[PDB]
Nucleic acid binder design. Structure first.
Ligand SMILES: O=C(O)CNC(=O)C(=O)O
Ligand SMILES: [Fe+2]
Ligand SMILES: [Zn+2]
Ligand SMILES: [Zn+2]
Ligand SMILES: [Zn+2]
Length: 416
DNA sequence: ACACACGTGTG
DNA sequence: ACACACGTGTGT
């Protein structure tokens, strides 16, 4: 759409549905309008796309810079990318929005408790490729099967076998299936996530209207493939991640021109603004580094944030981890090894920009397009997790009524 | 190209 | 508890 000219990967994935404008100043104007507040309440960080991925010696997620909530006065964090070379009307795009005070703290406290107890006792683990490094030998979730970090997926999901909702053949699908057949437990679980899906829809509409609008386009066509209890239902699936290390990946089944909302819950020792948690999980963009200047282009302003901790400049580590003796085999013992990261820290252009999302916060990013990851916990324990994330998304080709049951019957009706 | 996947209902 | 049928996109 611009004659800056064409457009490549050197500048990063291009999209505007989280927001775009000719300069950082214009982004503040958009965000102040959406959020209803001007000034210190909104924080914008410029991040530079380098295309060079930060990872450990074993190929597992690491951070290099941590963007942390600067003060209780900061309500909304915005990460932006100024696209290299562009002077057009979409020169600066929004790649992540973080609402610090996303849901009520009393609900976050209760969801932390309810989801942990329900899922550890009744949850069916969902196997995902991003649970493992590329060599598939790492142990970032932990090795105790009773306690290891894990991911549980609910709602509707896309299926290559139907090119549509996996529930195409299910009379009365179970969107929140738990081990056994305890309907009362599944209904409680369902009610919590349906309620939360209902609470977050308006927050999504408010802060990322274009993305939100794309996700409700076929709401009245495929309502069986949407969550939520009130008009305006952008979400289709929800995944709960309990101390789960999501290795660098993109959410490739996600619908184009959408986004994912991540609601973070944290263990009880990490719920005060100025607190030293024994551990914490971070959300990382491994292809980005931080700028030398703040939102307004001041070097000293950026240096003040570095020494204040609002941007935590991390340093290299050398730790001992476990490596599986055999890789985990695909759908189709252990030994100790050193894991380093000096190499990611020696190159200033190897990326690793992390945010530290708080209890009850809401994170919005286009996970289909941006490589993203979560850091492994020191002692993962899904029975008492350091962090729970609830990832709300809509997969592609989820626009048929009744989970696509009509097209499937019509499909098999092409018979001989 | 081509290995791989936030699966489920049949029998 | 198993086997089998159904078959898409992407990043590289
Ligand atoms: O929990 C987070 O912050 C990110 N989670 C994911 O990217 C995922 O499970 O696909
Ligand atoms: Fe993801
Ligand atoms: Zn790993
Ligand atoms: Zn341009
Ligand atoms: Zn469905």
């Amino acid at each position: 759409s611009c004659r800056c000219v064409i457009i490549e990967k050197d500048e990063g994935p291009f999209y505007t549905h989280l927001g775009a404008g000719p300069n950082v100043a214009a982004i503040r104007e958009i965000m102040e309008e959406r959020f209803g507040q001007k000034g210190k309440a909104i924080r914008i960080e410029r991040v530079i796309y380098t295309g060079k991925e930060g990872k450990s010696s074993q190929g597992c997620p690491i951070a290099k810079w941590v963007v942390r909530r600067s003060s209780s006065e900061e309500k909304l964090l915005c990460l932006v990318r100024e696209r290299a070379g562009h002077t057009c009307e979409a020169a600066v795009i929004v790649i992540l929005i973080l609402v610090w005070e996303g849901i009520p703290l009393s609900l976050a406290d209760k969801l932390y408790s309810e989801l942990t107890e329900t899922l550890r006792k009744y949850g069916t683990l969902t196997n995902r490729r991003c649970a493992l490094n590329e060599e598939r030998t790492c142990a970032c979730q932990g090795l105790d099967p009773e306690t290891c970090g894990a991911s549980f997926s609910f709602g509707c999901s896309w299926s290559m076998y139907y090119n549509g909702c996996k529930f195409a053949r299910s009379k009365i699908p179970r969107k929140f299936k738990l081990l056994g057949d305890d309907p009362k437990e599944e209904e409680k679980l369902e009610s919590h996530l349906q309620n939360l899906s209902t609470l977050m829809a308006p927050t999504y509409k408010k802060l990322a209207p274009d993305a939100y609008n794309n996700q409700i386009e076929y709401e009245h066509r495929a309502p069986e493939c949407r969550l939520g209890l009130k008009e305006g239902r952008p979400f289709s699936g929800v995944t709960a991640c309990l101390d789960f290390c999501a290795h660098a990946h993109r959410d490739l089944h996600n619908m184009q021109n959408g986004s994912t909302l991540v609601c973070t819950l944290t263990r009880e020792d990490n719920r005060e603004f100025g607190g030293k948690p024994e551990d914490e999980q971070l959300h990382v963009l491994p292809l980005y580094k931080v700028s030398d200047v703040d939102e307004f282009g001041s070097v000293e302003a950026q240096e003040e944030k570095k020494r204040s901790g609002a941007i935590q400049v991390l340093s290299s580590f050398r730790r001992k981890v476990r490596m599986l003796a055999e890789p985990v085999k695909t759908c189709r013992g252990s030994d100790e090894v050193w894991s380093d990261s000096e190499q990611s820290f020696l190159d200033p252009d190897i990326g690793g920009v992390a945010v530290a999302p708080t209890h009850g916060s809401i994170l919005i990013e286009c996970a289909k397009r941006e490589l993203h990851a979560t850091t492994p916990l020191k002692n993962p324990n899904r029975n008492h997790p350091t962090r729970i994330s609830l990832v709300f998304y809509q997969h592609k080709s989820m626009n048929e009524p009744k989970h696509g049951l009509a097209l499937w019957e019509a499909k098999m009706a092409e018979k001989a």
